Design an enzyme around this catalytic site. Structure first.
Site, mmCIF file in Angstrom:
data_model
loop_
_atom_site.group_PDB
_atom_site.id
_atom_site.type_symbol
_atom_site.label_atom_id
_atom_site.label_comp_id
_atom_site.label_asym_id
_atom_site.label_seq_id
_atom_site.Cartn_x
_atom_site.Cartn_y
_atom_site.Cartn_z
ATOM 1 N N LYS A 123 0.666 -1.272 0.362
ATOM 2 C CA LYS A 123 0.165 0.456 0.009
ATOM 3 C C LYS A 123 0.741 1.357 0.146
ATOM 4 O O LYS A 123 0.317 2.532 -0.532
ATOM 5 C CB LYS A 123 -0.706 -0.454 1.323
ATOM 6 C CG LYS A 123 -1.539 1.214 1.802
ATOM 7 C CD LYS A 123 -2.793 0.626 2.719
ATOM 8 C CE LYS A 123 -2.578 -0.754 3.318
ATOM 9 N NZ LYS A 123 -1.805 -0.655 4.350
ATOM 10 N N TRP A 130 7.126 -1.051 -8.073
ATOM 11 C CA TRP A 130 8.395 -1.476 -7.697
ATOM 12 C C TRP A 130 9.490 -1.989 -7.652
ATOM 13 O O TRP A 130 10.774 -1.479 -7.505
ATOM 14 C CB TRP A 130 7.590 -2.543 -6.416
ATOM 15 C CG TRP A 130 9.190 -3.328 -5.458
ATOM 16 C CD1 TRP A 130 9.339 -3.208 -4.413
ATOM 17 C CD2 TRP A 130 9.967 -3.883 -5.681
ATOM 18 N NE1 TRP A 130 9.603 -3.782 -3.433
ATOM 19 C CE2 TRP A 130 10.658 -4.697 -4.606
ATOM 20 C CE3 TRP A 130 10.482 -5.157 -6.516
ATOM 21 C CZ2 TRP A 130 11.569 -5.439 -4.495
ATOM 22 C CZ3 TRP A 130 11.278 -5.756 -6.438
ATOM 23 C CH2 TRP A 130 11.969 -6.151 -5.669
ATOM 24 N N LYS A 156 12.738 -4.975 11.453
ATOM 25 C CA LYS A 156 12.861 -4.937 10.426
ATOM 26 C C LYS A 156 12.914 -3.765 10.372
ATOM 27 O O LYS A 156 11.740 -2.471 10.779
ATOM 28 C CB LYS A 156 12.703 -6.095 9.109
ATOM 29 N N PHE A 173 -4.371 -0.397 7.824
ATOM 30 C CA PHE A 173 -4.713 -2.101 7.772
ATOM 31 C C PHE A 173 -5.478 -2.120 6.353
ATOM 32 O O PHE A 173 -5.124 -0.968 5.216
ATOM 33 C CB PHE A 173 -5.241 -1.816 9.076
ATOM 34 C CG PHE A 173 -4.515 -2.291 10.705
ATOM 35 C CD1 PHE A 173 -3.047 -2.865 10.112
ATOM 36 C CD2 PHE A 173 -5.504 -2.034 11.981
ATOM 37 C CE1 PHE A 173 -2.389 -2.634 11.420
ATOM 38 C CE2 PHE A 173 -4.518 -2.232 13.227
ATOM 39 C CZ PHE A 173 -2.979 -2.838 12.720
ATOM 40 N N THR A 220 3.857 1.609 -0.805
ATOM 41 C CA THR A 220 4.814 1.306 -1.825
ATOM 42 C C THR A 220 3.900 2.087 -3.541
ATOM 43 O O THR A 220 4.351 2.372 -4.493
ATOM 44 C CB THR A 220 5.163 0.189 -2.245
ATOM 45 O OG1 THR A 220 6.693 -0.073 -2.132
ATOM 46 C CG2 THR A 220 4.963 -0.337 -4.004
ATOM 47 N N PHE A 274 3.777 -9.375 -9.244
ATOM 48 C CA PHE A 274 4.756 -10.100 -8.782
ATOM 49 C C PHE A 274 4.677 -10.704 -9.902
ATOM 50 O O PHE A 274 4.127 -11.984 -10.079
ATOM 51 C CB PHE A 274 4.230 -10.328 -7.653
ATOM 52 C CG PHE A 274 5.676 -11.410 -6.168
ATOM 53 C CD1 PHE A 274 5.334 -12.595 -6.633
ATOM 54 C CD2 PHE A 274 5.764 -10.399 -5.357
ATOM 55 C CE1 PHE A 274 6.459 -12.978 -4.815
ATOM 56 C CE2 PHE A 274 6.371 -10.819 -4.339
ATOM 57 C CZ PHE A 274 6.664 -12.117 -4.690
ATOM 58 N N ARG A 324 2.426 8.445 6.960
ATOM 59 C CA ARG A 324 2.675 8.986 8.460
ATOM 60 C C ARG A 324 4.321 8.188 8.480
ATOM 61 O O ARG A 324 5.153 7.850 8.420
ATOM 62 C CB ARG A 324 1.966 7.547 8.697
ATOM 63 C CG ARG A 324 0.768 7.645 8.711
ATOM 64 C CD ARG A 324 -0.071 6.137 9.328
ATOM 65 N NE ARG A 324 0.131 5.101 8.093
ATOM 66 C CZ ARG A 324 0.008 4.133 8.615
ATOM 67 N NH1 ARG A 324 -0.648 3.335 9.926
ATOM 68 N NH2 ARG A 324 0.215 3.066 7.858
ATOM 69 N N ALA A 377 -3.539 1.822 14.210
ATOM 70 C CA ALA A 377 -5.307 1.611 13.318
ATOM 71 C C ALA A 377 -6.064 1.219 13.908
ATOM 72 O O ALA A 377 -7.060 0.979 13.268
ATOM 73 C CB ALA A 377 -4.515 1.158 11.786
#
Ligand SMILES: Nc1ncnc2c1ncn2[C@@H]1O[C@H](COP(=O)(O)OP(=O)(O)O)[C@@H](O)[C@H]1O
Lengths: 555, 557
Positions: free
Chosen positions: B72, B410, B106, B302, B74, B382, B95, B274
């Protein structure tokens, strides 16, 4: 007018100018608004071979509630030296945020001898203290986590010396139990919080040569012990990298200025009892390559700050202080002669002579390091002429250069007399600097010398805990470090009511803590306050800010 | 081809932000640099542009989350960059992430691949210190509460009813349940309490819903910290804390200008939860964008059942915003998870399980419809997806009446989002929106809860515990009953059962507890257990993180 009115009336020069005027490349400056910046570590790294300017320390006589003005004097002296056309900087400590909401909210100096912008210095500034705090607490997080994950290293949670930090004065977090609520939620244990400026991490920031040295120190820290007594470190936990990374901007000194646009560094701000009381080494050493004259200072009296400055900071950095000013007031001196704060405005020639003994001792002590002293009298409006002259005289009878300083009232112009006596000293009195003690001495030996040579103690007494604690640290090989004396500041002794200069007394060492990270040993003599609390009506209650961004109740 | 995220962040040439500021019509005296690649913008920008018309507003949401990822942020960034290529004056608002993750699980780039906002390292670490200020205001208030007990407890607060906890922006499990105030009469008043992760702070929620500084102060004043022995609420106003908290946020209220890998200007500002909150960036940031650009893209935490619903029903409501379009992000991979396929075999083509999980996506589109906002699906491409799966996704999107586009932002950055961007623009030109909130504030709490649960979640109905029924009556008695509702529920289902994937039917939601945010100005019904403070893993990221003399970082991403 008032300190804050003066700050606001002032005209500030963009800091990039100043940066540039010092020979700082625009690619080494990092603005935080147009009046603060961080200077890269590369500056020193490239000027590593230029000669160091002259190093000048501002210390003082034993503190009193009547006030000394040790900062005011570092900044005023600095503003005089600028007016004599000298290439000079001032290095200072960043205050904690915590006072601003409890009691004070104070000027970095005062009157016409401040560093600015004052608001930012008292609030978040460039976030240096947020990063210490996050670094300290991540480590504790990682400790408590390591218990939860099977406690491979076999730490006894009840032995853990590593606590938590926050830069508010919260008495409620002095003693807590954490780890509650079940097997999901950690391991119950007793612990608590200290004020962030007291963090060993803050101590490390202030005694590190560069970021990689900051990292190695981090790795050396002692968080607690195994069930057998083997010590566990931040590096046993693999904490050091994360903590270094969280300090990569914090390690860079912050460039600001005086009301008169002389360049100033503000960087670090540790405790002067359980720690050494100086700004960082990074800033002072950088200032040395950027200026001909560097003026810096240290917390509490010269028995504590100056002694540690010389015995810890200078030893680590390889600095050879070229002179040292000692501040005094006629007010403060009379208190040391038994006059109470009520009666400080009534003239008292008799009291001033007796109280002089305090100052006389400091001068002698400064003597011991082979640094040429200068007394600087902070002028006060109710001081009679008889008094001052008598003081002047008594310093000379003690073979000490002395000047009148009215830098509070008149700025760089009130510092000229003192500046000149300083310059007179640098050119004509070469300093013969040496540390007070050798590191190879034992711990008890080191404490003796300081206690006898500097405080004037007949000797030192140890409790059974302290004896057992020293015997342990020496046995772990922490016995050839320096020593950082957690004593009261209001007397040469450890009796806060024994106003200087007492004789026929001994010092008692009740506890001994370790700062392997910072790299020193801390004898405690009184109960030490690592986390103060708010008064009945905290300043917070009366602080405000309106639509126009006008702030009130902060100063 | 595609490098690592961090290899990309460093290879990209950033423009000084002051240029970008000027490009946007921002005056030098409204910008405040934090280095040459970050800046805080004055609230006076919005004030002088208060009468200009607003740009278009475009929300990026997604289907029901999984471990297996969605895409999202991205998309949000890539959409933005395509629009910039198409010559449009556009901004993205996002945000600021919490510091915590970077040291546990990570460090996650703000986006990814060639769809990133930068500088990456700073956004993840201290950025411009907004989260530190939130932390200091929250804990100052809590220090002020405990002190008030110590000083004679004049307001007669019962320590044991105190709702105001403390905060820190690290994942520390050991602090969730603590006892403080110990050591004697000189050291406070013993009591049970705890810490929550700083981004959960109501302070953060207030930052993200304030109109400006004086409003953020008023909110603060209204915050409820605990109750008297009689049941009366005691607010932060009652302890005169609101001025100091505001003062501690004087720089934190300004949105932070930054940019994408392709120099498209961007605001990062605010960063709440959220579930117990609304999962959006600040109104201040979004409203300023809308004055400085013809197009503004922003997003919500979310899936659309949660963030989108709260974006519309809380944020847009407070702001007077009318969203002109909405994008929904889906992946083939995740849609198969919703039709039963486990993560181990997601690569294997499976048209039947894809057809079945599309139900998830179908339901969200419908829901977006219920707000009057034209939807557009964005299929995050993908490499293991087959063309047969993708074509069946497009078919199903049409049969359900939604435009749809492939997105390869991406891999290819702005170019990989031109097709979507053009679809979004088709929609803005041809299908103006009919935005309305889902529910009137005048309904009762249980009525509002039921509307959400039935209209959005697909639920039959809603059950309450005795505790919830006590809390709701309590909140209604005190007059907090005409407030919006912020449903803390799992994200991985429409249900409150995190295993019920896809579009579950014949089910009932259960409300175990109900908290209050008087300052943020809403009611929070809890349906599960709610983790307001995560803990570290067996081998945390901090252990493997290092930084050498050359300033090189490792193990951070
Ligand atoms: N098309 C793609 N190919 C490879 N990785 C992707 C693709 N889209 C997203 N990702 C990565 O997978 C994760 C899901 O996207 P992200 O924006 O992170 O998710 P969200 O914002 O929806 O939580 C991200 O970290 C992102 O870097």
């Amino acid at each position: 007018p008032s300190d804050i009115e003066i700050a606001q009336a002032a005209k500030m020069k963009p800091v990039m100018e100043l940066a540039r005027g010092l020979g700082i490349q625009e690619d080494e400056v990092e603005l935080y608004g147009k009046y603060k910046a961080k200077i890269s570590l590369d500056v020193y790294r490239r000027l590593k071979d230029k000669p160091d300017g002259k190093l000048i320390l501002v210390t003082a006589i034993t503190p009193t509630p009547a006030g000394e003005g040790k900062t005011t004097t570092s900044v005023g002296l600095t503003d005089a030296l600028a007016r004599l056309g000298k290439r000079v900087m001032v290095c200072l400590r960043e205050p904690s945020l915590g006072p601003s909401f409890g009691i004070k909210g104070g000027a970095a100096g005062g009157g016409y001898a401040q560093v600015v912008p004052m608001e930012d210095i008292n609030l978040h500034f460039t976030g240096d203290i947020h990063a210490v705090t996050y670094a300290h607490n991540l480590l504790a997080a990682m400790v408590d986590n390591h218990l939860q994950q099977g406690n491979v290293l076999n730490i006894d949670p009840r032995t853990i010396t590593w606590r938590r930090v926050i830069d508010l004065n919260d008495r409620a977090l002095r003693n807590i139990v954490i780890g509650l609520g079940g097997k999901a939620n950690g391991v119950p244990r007793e612990t608590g919080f200290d004020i962030s400026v007291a963090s060993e991490v803050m101590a490390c920031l202030c005694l590190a040569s560069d970021l990689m040295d900051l990292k190695e120190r981090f790795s050396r820290i002692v968080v607690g012990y195994t069930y057998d007594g083997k010590p566990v470190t931040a590096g046993d936990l693999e904490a050091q990298g994360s903590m270094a990374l969280l300090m990569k901007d914090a390690i860079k000194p912050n460039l600001v200025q005086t009301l008169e646009n002389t360049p100033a560094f503000i960087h670090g701000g540790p405790f002067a009892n359980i720690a050494h009381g100086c700004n960082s080494i990074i800033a002072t050493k950088t200032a040395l390559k950027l200026a001909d004259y560097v003026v810096t200072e240290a917390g509490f009296g010269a028995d504590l700050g100056a002694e540690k400055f010389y015995d810890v900071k200078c030893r680590y950095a390889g600095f050879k202080p070229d002179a040292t000013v000692i501040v005094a007031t006629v007010r403060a001196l009379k208190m040391h002669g038994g006059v109470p704060k009520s009666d400080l405005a009534t003239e008292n020639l008799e009291a001033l002579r007796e109280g002089f003994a305090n100052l006389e001792k400091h001068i002698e002590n400064i003597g011991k390091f082979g640094v040429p002293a200068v007394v600087a009298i902070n002028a006060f409006p109710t001081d009679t002429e008889a008094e001052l002259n008598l003081l002047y005289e008594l310093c000379a009878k003690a073979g000490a250069e002395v000047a009148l300083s009215e830098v509070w009232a008149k700025g760089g112009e009130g510092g000229l007399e003192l500046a000149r006596k300083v310059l007179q000293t640098l050119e004509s009195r070469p300093s013969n600097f040496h540390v007070l003690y050798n590191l190879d001495l034992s711990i008890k030996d080191k404490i003796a010398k300081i206690a006898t040579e500097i405080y004037g103690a007949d000797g030192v007494n140890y409790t059974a805990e302290a004896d057992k604690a020293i015997q342990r640290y020496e046995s772990l090989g922490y016995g050839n470090l320096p020593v950082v004396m957690a004593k009261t500041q209001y007397s040469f002794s450890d009796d806060m009511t024994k106003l200087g200069r007492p004789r026929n007394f001994t010092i008692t060492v009740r506890e001994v803590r370790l700062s392997a990270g910072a790299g020193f040993i801390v004898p405690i003599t009184g109960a030490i306050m690592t986390m103060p609390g708010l008064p009945k009506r905290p300043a917070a209650c009366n602080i405000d800010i309106d639509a126009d961004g006008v702030i009130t109740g902060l100063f």
